[PDB]
Amino acid sequence: DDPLQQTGQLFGGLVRDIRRRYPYYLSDITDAFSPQVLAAVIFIYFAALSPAITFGGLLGEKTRNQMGVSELLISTAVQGILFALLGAQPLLVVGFSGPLLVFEEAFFSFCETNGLEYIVGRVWIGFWLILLVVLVVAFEGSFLVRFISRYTQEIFSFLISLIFIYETFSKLIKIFQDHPLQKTYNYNVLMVPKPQGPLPNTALLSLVLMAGTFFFAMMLRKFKNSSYFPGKLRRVIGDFGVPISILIMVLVDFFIQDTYTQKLSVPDGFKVSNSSARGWVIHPLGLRSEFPIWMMFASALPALLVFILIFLESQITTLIVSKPERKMVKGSGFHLDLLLVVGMGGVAALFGMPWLSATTVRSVTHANALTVMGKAQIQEVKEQRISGLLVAVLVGLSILMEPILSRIPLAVLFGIFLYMGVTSLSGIQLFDRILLLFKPPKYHPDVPYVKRVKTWRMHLFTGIQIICLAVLWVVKSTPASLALPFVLILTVPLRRVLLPLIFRNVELQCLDADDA
């Protein structure tokens, strides 16, 4: 029954993953028939879209429009639809991530330096990723995911959410730096690409919209598990907590018409950003210049790095989402998801669209959205394919529904990112122990490790995980950001060889447990 086992035959895990979930496929359609599911579709849409808009914008300027917002949106749409329809864990949101953007920057700079075609280079990376993932899934390489314990899962899960929170505030600060609070402003300024100068009331309204959206979302989450209004109405309003918070604060900005706020800009149509550069289908052998055969084979070495990026990102996200404490009964497959995510991404490279990964926050957020609360204990989770499908389709149709997206500020969706960032920390025992450092020892949650492990030893354990978080954040800050996944890999040796020396088994078993 345990997914992470070596069968001892070629593609044994892949078959066993299909065999376990596809029996539930008719349930994966009906279970979606709930208002809570529709509230998740609306929430996770904006959670899924705005990153693809942002990263696409960032790719555009750092890759000279070889790959822009349109390519990313279509990729997130097509791979999102397929993965929802064919995957093992539909609650995983497949999209673009920060470590993937860093690779594209380095790959572009590498290609620029050596003087090779970037987009043609990726096609080969994509082919080697298809070769590697088939070779990995063949021998059931996802068995090594067993070794990654809560220690490494939580260190990861915490770091990703901090980033998500950090970046959100970095955008608010950027708005304030762009539109400073001056004494006088210049009004003879163009706003056709974007505002050339500073603008009045822009930065403060952006803060008001961000703070307000995070407030309303949190207060409606507080309202969900309150004792006000009838139980039906309290849940319905609580389930649609974010969509109400968005609608309100979007309508707030709609009425404030004279003042400027930065909105969600999408491409005009379904066309590549730079048409002169590349077409919709990228040629392996080359576009303009004849692509070298040395790079055609040496594409293996970056593809190995991209595989490790997509593997760890996706497989650790699968762990986090399919934890025992989260009441997920339909079953999670680590081989079929890895095969699709990388396999699709490899074929996506052929059409000059970016390979994606099962992103942690968006996956967690989508799981948390579909998770229902009893009495605070988790009753069940609405595990189905319709939520992940509809989000992907809506992301695909984002280019068409510009009229609607044009009235939605970025400030409000940054308020939603802050809500996603804070909410992501909820079921992380690391974060729980970070709070206990500040709380006195008498006022502890009396959890198994609190009762058994000594207070100073528990804090010492928590201390070492901050040292790891700190080191990971330093590695992230430095140019060597593609080394970050390999530093997180060292978190597994730590718990395996280093901690057993300074700590005891009894404490280690209590602090780091598979189930709680």
Ligand X SMILES: OCCN(CCO)c1nc(N2CCCCC2)c2nc(N(CCO)CCO)nc(N3CCCCC3)c2n1
Ligand Y SMILES: CC(C)CCC[C@@H](C)[C@H]1CC[C@H]2[C@@H]3CC=C4C[C@@H](O)CC[C@]4(C)[C@H]3CC[C@]12C
Ligand Z SMILES: *[C@@H]1O[C@H](CO)[C@@H](O[C@H]2O[C@H](CO)[C@@H](O)[C@H](O)[C@H]2NC(C)=O)[C@H](O)[C@H]1NC(C)=O
Please report, as ranges, the residues that interact with a second copy according to CB under 8 A: 180-185, 187, 200-201, 203-205, 207-208, 211, 227-231, 256, 258-259, 435, 438-440, 443
Minimum Å distance from CB 391 to ligand Y?
A: 11
Residue in the shown chain whose Cβ atom is closest to ligand Y: 396
Region 462-481 residues binding ligand X, contact defined as CB under 6 A: 476, 481
Region 240-279 residues binding ligand Z, contact defined as CB under 6 A: 274, 276-277
Does residue 57 belong to the site contacting ligand Z (CB under 6 A)? no
Does residue 65 belong to the site contacting ligand Z (CB under 6 A)? yes
Nearer to ligand X, 58 or 395 (CB): 58
**What's the chain's length in residues?**
516
Residues 6+ apart with CB under 8 A from 169: 418
Does residue 102 belong to the site contacting ligand X (CB under 6 A)? yes
Does residue 77 belong to the site contacting ligand Y (CB under 6 A)? yes
Contact of 71 with 278, CB cutoff 8 Å: no
Work out the widest C-alpha separation in the chain, in whole angstroms.
73
Beta bridge partners of 372: 380
Q: List the single partner that 181 binds among ligand PC1, ligand Y, ligand X, none, CB under 5 to 8 Å by kind.
A: ligand PC1
Does residue 460 belong to the site contacting ligand Y (CB under 6 A)? yes
* DSSP summary character for residue 292: P
Does residue 187 belong to the site contacting ligand PC1 (CB under 6 A)? no
Q: What's the sign of the alpha-carbon dihedral 350, 351, 352, 354?
A: negative
SS3 content of the chain, % helix, strand, coil (to 5): 65, 5, 35
Specify the 3-state DSSP secondary structure of 373: strand
Minimum Å distance from CB 515 to ligand Y?
A: 27
CA–CA dist 312, 323 (Å, integer): 16
E-strand ranges in 337-392 read 357-358, 371-374, 377-381
End-to-end CA distance of the chain: 19
Does residue 401 belong to the site contacting ligand Y (CB under 6 A)? no
Residue in the shown chain whose Cβ atom is closest to ligand X: 98
CA–CA dist 495, 271 (Å, integer): 49
Does residue 64 belong to the site contacting ligand Z (CB under 6 A)? yes
Stretch that binds ligand Y, among 188-196, 215-223, 420-428, 455-463 (CB under 6 A): 455-463
Q: List the single partner that 437 binds among ligand X, ligand Y, ligand PC1, none, CB under 5 to 8 Å by kind.
A: ligand Y
Q: List the single partner that 247 binds among ligand Z, ligand Y, ligand PC1, none, CB under 5 to 8 Å by kind.
A: ligand Y
CA–CA dist 463, 263 (Å, integer): 42
Measured CA distances, 156 to 149, 161, 353, 470, 511 (Å): 11, 9, 27, 12, 16
Q: What's the sign of the alpha-carbon dihedral 88, 161, 311, 510?
A: negative
Position 27, amino acid: S
Region 193-222 residues binding ligand PC1, contact defined as CB under 6 A: 207-208, 210-212, 214-215, 218
Rg of the chain over CA atoms, in angstroms?
Answer: 23
Question: How many residues touch ligand X (CB under 6 A)?
Answer: 21
Residues 6+ apart with CB under 8 A from 356: 75, 76, 79, 94, 95, 96, 97, 100, 310, 341, 344, 345, 348
Region 167-226 residues binding ligand X, contact defined as CB under 6 A: 167-168
Minimum Å distance from CB 256 to ligand X?
A: 24
Site string for ligand PC1, 403-442 (x = CB under 6 A): -------------------x--------------------
291, 417, 449, 503: residue in contact with ligand X (rule CB under 6 A): 417
Q: List the single partner that 98 binds among ligand PC1, ligand Y, ligand Z, none, CB under 5 to 8 Å by kind.
A: none
The Cβ of residue 23 has, within 10 Å, a number of other Cβ atoms equal to: 11
Binding site for ligand PC1 (CB under 6 A): 172-173, 176, 180-181, 207-208, 210-212, 214-215, 218, 252, 255-256, 422
Binding site for ligand Z (CB under 6 A): 64-65, 274, 276-277
